[PDB]
């Protein structure tokens, strides 16, 4: 909770410019997860 | 409920400098965002800059650039504008305001202090 | 820089109306805004950001929306609380800007 020589703030901070390249523009990701278990199922969405 | 409050009124003398200051007293500081902004009277409100009250950042604004600058001490929980240069327009009303608290940083002004009332004049 | 402009300067009412507020801008702005009330002689009170949200602790008669460029702000019901300006902060790039001021009144 200082800042100092040997201390280090953990937070840095993305300067997201659109003059910036490819390499280093933004990205909104977003990661699903999928699992088989004992009681019966319930998101099923399945044929039509 | 965070409050903010701040110095009385002042006035000064062209060429001069002054040093506004408001204090905190949010429930916790997740890198909190003092953020000044001012007022002309009778005119469009003018915007400052951001201190980013978790650590030390300093983006400041372009009209106002290489003249003011802004600091923040950790254990008062206030925030500290300074301003050199001045001159008759800066006459205004200053204000204190920031204070996201959910996520750590916006761009809108959520928690006002109730102003500082400045005056340049000869 | 973006440029804030407020369509009306002033706006005329009367108790429990509905009233409506322009706030153009000279460049694209991907729905980044808010609302702030200032009575006279008081400090600035926000309302709306994200053009679109309702920030808590305000009555229900505010709401906003639009997009682009041309955006609105509207109540249903004109309650007394409502008699001040009203301006627009732009935050969809640098120096953040504001508007011009669009006060009420009330009208006999």
């Known amino acids: 909770g200082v800042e100092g020589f040997n201390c280090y703030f953990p937070l840095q901070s993305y300067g997201f410019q659109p003059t910036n390249g490819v390499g280093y523009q933004p990205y909104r990701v977003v990661v699903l997860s999928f699992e088989l278990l004992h009681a019966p199922a319930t998101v099923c969405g399945p044929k039509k | 409920q965070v409050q903010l409050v701040q110095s009385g009124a002042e006035v000064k003398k062209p060429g001069a400098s002054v040093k506004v200051s408001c204090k905190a007293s949010g429930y916790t500081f997740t890198t909190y965002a003092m953020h000044w902004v001012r007022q002309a009277p009778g005119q469009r409100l003018e915007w400052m800059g951001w201190?980013?009250?978790?650590?030390?950042?300093?983006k400041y604004s372009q009209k106002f650039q290489g003249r003011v600058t802004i600091t923040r001490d950790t254990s008062a929980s206030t925030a500290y504008m300074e301003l050199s240069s001045l001159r008759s327009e800066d006459t205004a009303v200053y204000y204190c305001?920031?204070?996201?608290?959910?996520?750590?940083?916006?761009?809108?002004?959520?928690?006002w202090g109730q102003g500082t009332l400045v005056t340049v004049s000869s | 820089d973006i440029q804030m402009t407020q369509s009306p300067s002033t706006l005329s009412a009367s108790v429990g109306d509905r009233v409506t507020i322009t706030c153009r801008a000279s460049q694209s702005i991907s729905s980044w805004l808010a609302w702030y009330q200032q009575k006279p002689g008081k400090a600035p009170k926000l309302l709306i950001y994200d053009a679109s949200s309702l920030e808590s602790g305000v009555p229900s008669r505010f709401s906003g929306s639009g997009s682009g460029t041309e955006f609105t702000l509207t109540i249903s019901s004109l309650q007394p609380d409502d008699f001040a300006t009203y301006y627009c902060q732009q935050y969809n790039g640098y120096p953040w800007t504001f508007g011009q001021g669009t006060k009420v009144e009330i009208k006999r």
């Open positions: 305001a920031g204070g996201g608290g959910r996520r750590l940083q916006f761009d809108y002004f959520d928690y």
């Open positions: 201190i980013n009250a978790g650590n030390g950042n300093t």
